[PDB]
Amino acid sequence: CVMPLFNLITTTQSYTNSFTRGVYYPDKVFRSSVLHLTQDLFLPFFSNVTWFHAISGTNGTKRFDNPVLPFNDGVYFASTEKSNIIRGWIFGTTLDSKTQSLLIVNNATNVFIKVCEFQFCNDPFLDVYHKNNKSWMESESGVYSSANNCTFEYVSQPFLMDLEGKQGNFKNLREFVFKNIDGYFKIYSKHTPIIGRDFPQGFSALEPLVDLPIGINITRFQTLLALNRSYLTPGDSSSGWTAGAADYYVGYLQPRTFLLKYNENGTITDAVDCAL
């Protein structure tokens, strides 16, 4: 838990419209050409989602925004980045070794999910650096000091997420929905290419990714950012830790009734928020 001294900038919470994003598949049932009325935890249409930026400035001041945020009933996360600065999340009530906490991390080769009484640092983060100037790789030493009484572990999803490149804009509109229902931590996701720069207007249903039966109590969450040990911006001789530009939006799920439109192939192509 050692952090280099930085001219940290206080996090400023911007606000923006949610439009109609955040719709996922409520269940595993297949439906074709059906208007289905379902009550579930949804992100309401045209609500405020908070907006945060994580960037390294040209004057030496780096905005390393990793603030603790409430979880409430559910969380909708939207991420746009080029170097995968956003690498994972933490979940828990006290965020210490007293209570069990969940941690999701990108290992850069696999995806790590753990449920342990982690002794998290003040600002946990993943340390990416260049060994022998030959191998770029990541370490979890800056996240937690020790792990004890582990109850759930899952190393899976050998997917590098963004792989097509940065054609339109980073091609990395990463949308996730995190819910905690009946002891099930449900993660829905969607990888939308961006037609534009930030938060394009449109509709895309979130196919479920993983339903972890961790069965723990979670009321807070915080983003995990990757810090690289220099050698990111060409032409810069400043030997120090720098982080690439990244933007992420957070919205909060609430119990809403939606009218979803399943087309002939079983894909939710539209939705109506009955209380909008």
Partner: protein, 382 residues
């Protein structure tokens, strides 16, 4: 025969001329097929039930059981079965169902506290140690463990929560060691209005049966047909298609014919439903194949008679069914009403009202006598 069925329907030995909606025909299943996953490793029930040390009741151990075949016959081997209370499920049917997840809440309590481990119960253990949900589905197994959880000098390793500010919510574990406070005066230690919430059990072999330690394991199930996962030890059979059969797809029991489907399920989708929430398709656990499910052919059966005093001859209309399917079901003997009318070749006619047997279709047109439907009428004529 159809005439006797008409007589019983009218509750009269005399039948007037007409057509009577008498019964319903149904094609019967020819086989019973079950499809269960490749999973063969037995669930670690022995580890949970024969553990060397059991956690305290206030710190009940929740073991996760998933991705295994749940053979419950093992539980009958190492258990005297003092209490085997299954709520929401039948203990004899545990070997045939599919459970999404298994939760094993294991702890140790007193002998007289076993009855407190049930939904809607009240008591020290129920309110401050372990509370079950009102809609709990699963089983509770309690058995004596005096020979393994008692000491001559007293087994103080087991503790129970006797005092708490509020009753424990369902599936809530309290491990806080804060001294219980009675009133508004803060407690800085043991003394007036301050009591330790945790009290040692002090199990001893010399104690009575009602005070002897008892190991209690609560098996909580999520009886859902979509995720399947943990099911019982049933041998899966081969999959038949285009034939009406009784299918058991990962615990989902139904009757019908399974056909190849053009429906394109997304990888997470396990079955398909129709606009009125009727199951239209399923996914094979083994082959990951999308199979349309169609209930076996059925419909109404009407009996046309010229009057029981004119003649005893009748005709039968199977409503809304192709004559080919009716003939096929008769050949395989699948029709529910088993009084098959003799078929000659000219006796079988196909109306838009269904398949008519026992009436000869003529090319002459007469005034309607007995309305069959779709412009077709029957009459007793030379």
């Amino acid at each position: 025969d159809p005439l006797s069925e008409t007589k019983c329907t009218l509750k009269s030995f005399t039948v007037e001329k007409g057509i009577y909606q008498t019964s319903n025909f149904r094609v019967q299943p020819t086989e019973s097929i079950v499809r269960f996953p490749n999973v063969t490793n037995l669930c670690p029930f022995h580890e949970v039930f024969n553990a060397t040390r059991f956690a305290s009741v206030y710190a009940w151990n929740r073991t996760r059981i998933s991705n295994c075949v749940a053979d419950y016959s093992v539980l009958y081997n190492f258990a005297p079965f003092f209490a085997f209370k299954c709520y929401g499920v039948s203990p004899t049917k545990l070997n045939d169902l599919c459970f999404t997840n298994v939760y094993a809440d294991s702890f140790v309590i007193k002998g007289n506290e076993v009855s407190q481990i049930a939904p809607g119960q009240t008591g020290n253990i129920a309110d401050y140690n372990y509370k079950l949900p009102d809609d709990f589905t699963g089983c509770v197994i309690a058995w004596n463990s005096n020979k393994l959880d008692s000491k001559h000098s007293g087994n103080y390793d087991y503790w129970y929560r006797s005092f708490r500010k509020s009753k424990l919510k369902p599936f809530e574990r309290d491990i806080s060691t804060e001294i219980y406070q009675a009133g508004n005066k803060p407690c800085k230690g043991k003394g007036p209005n301050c009591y330790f919430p945790l009290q040692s059990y002090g199990f001893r072999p010399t104690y009575g049966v009602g005070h002897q330690p008892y190991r209690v394991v609560v098996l909580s199930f999520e009886l859902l047909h979509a995720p399947a996962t943990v099911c019982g030890p049933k041998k899966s059979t081969n999959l038949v298609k285009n034939k009406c059969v009784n299918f058991n797809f990962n615990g989902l029991t139904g009757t019908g014919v399974l056909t190849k489907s053009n429906k394109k399920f997304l990888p997470f989708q396990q079955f398909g439903r129709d606009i009125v929430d009727t199951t239209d398709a399923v996914r094979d656990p083994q082959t990951l194949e999308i199979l349309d499910i169609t209930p076996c052919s059925f419909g109404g059966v009407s009996v046309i008679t010229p009057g029981t005093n004119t003649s005893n001859q009748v005709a039968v209309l199977y409503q809304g069914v192709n004559c080919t399917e009716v003939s096929v079901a008769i050949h395989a003997d699948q029709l529910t009403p088993t009084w098959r009318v003799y078929s000659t070749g000219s006796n079988v006619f196909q109306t838009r009202a269904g398949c008519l047997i026992g009436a000869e279709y003529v090319n002459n047109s007469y005034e309607c006598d007995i309305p069959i439907g779709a412009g077709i009428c029957a009459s007793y004529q030379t």
